[PDB]
Amino acid sequence: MLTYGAPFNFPRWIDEHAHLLKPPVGNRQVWQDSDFIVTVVGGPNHRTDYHDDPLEEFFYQLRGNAYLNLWVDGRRERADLKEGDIFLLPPHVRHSVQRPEAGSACLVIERQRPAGMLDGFEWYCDACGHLVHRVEVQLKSIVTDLPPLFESFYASEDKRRCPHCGQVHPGRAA
Numbered sequence: 001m002l003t004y005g006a007p008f009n010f011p012r013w014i015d016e017h018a019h020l021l022k023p024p025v026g027n028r029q030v031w032q033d034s035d036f037i038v039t040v041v042g043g044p045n046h047r048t049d050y051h052d053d054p055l056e057e058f059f060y061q062l063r064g065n066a067y068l069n070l071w072v073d074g075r076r077e078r079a080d081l082k083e084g085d086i087f088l089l090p091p092h093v094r095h096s097v098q099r100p101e102a103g104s105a106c107l108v109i110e111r112q113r114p115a116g117m118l119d120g121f122e123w124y125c126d127a128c129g130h131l132v133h134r135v136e137v138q139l140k141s142i143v144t145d146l147p148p149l150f151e152s153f154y155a156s157e158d159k160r161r162c163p164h165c166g167q168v169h170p171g172r173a174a
């Protein structure tokens with residue numbers, strides 16, 4: 001009843017999964033069907049969507065650097081995950097994680113969401129900073145519940161059009 005296997009060396013597990021910690025794939029979840037979702041995230045990867053997590057997110061940047069674009073107190077903000085940094089993100093703080101560096105590796109820990117506890121994914125207008133669009137999801141598996149969400153935002157000018165100025169968000173790349 002060691003459901004998740006025995007202890008294993010983390011530095012070598014990362015090395016052996018280097019090929020998955022780059023595009024297209026970029027991340028890799030360590031254990032399946034656990035309440036703690038433990039993930040190593042590589043790079044490079046940039047993104048425009050902001051995440052509204054209904055629970056906390058723990059970060060430990062083992063290798064290389066990254067940063068988070070944030071909305072805090074109503075203003076845009078960057079928080080830097082220099083190598084060796086740890087960070088706890090409180091629920092519902094909008095965050096957009098940028099990972100410019102190949103060969104980087106960040107341990108990210110989250111919890112399964114209970115039924116009815118929803119995640120949100122939002123884009124904002126580069127022009128007027130207004131909320132451009134938001135999907136809420138019952139997040140079960142990032143691999144099938146998230147890609148289609150981004151794809152459908154990039155494909156629809158109607159979803160990218162700011163409802164306050166009319167600027168059509170550029171979609172995938174800022």
Ligand SMILES: [Fe+2]
Nearest residue numbers: 051053057095
């Ligand atoms: Fe997140």
Ligand SMILES: [Fe+2]
Nearest residue numbers: 125128162165
């Ligand atoms: Fe706008």
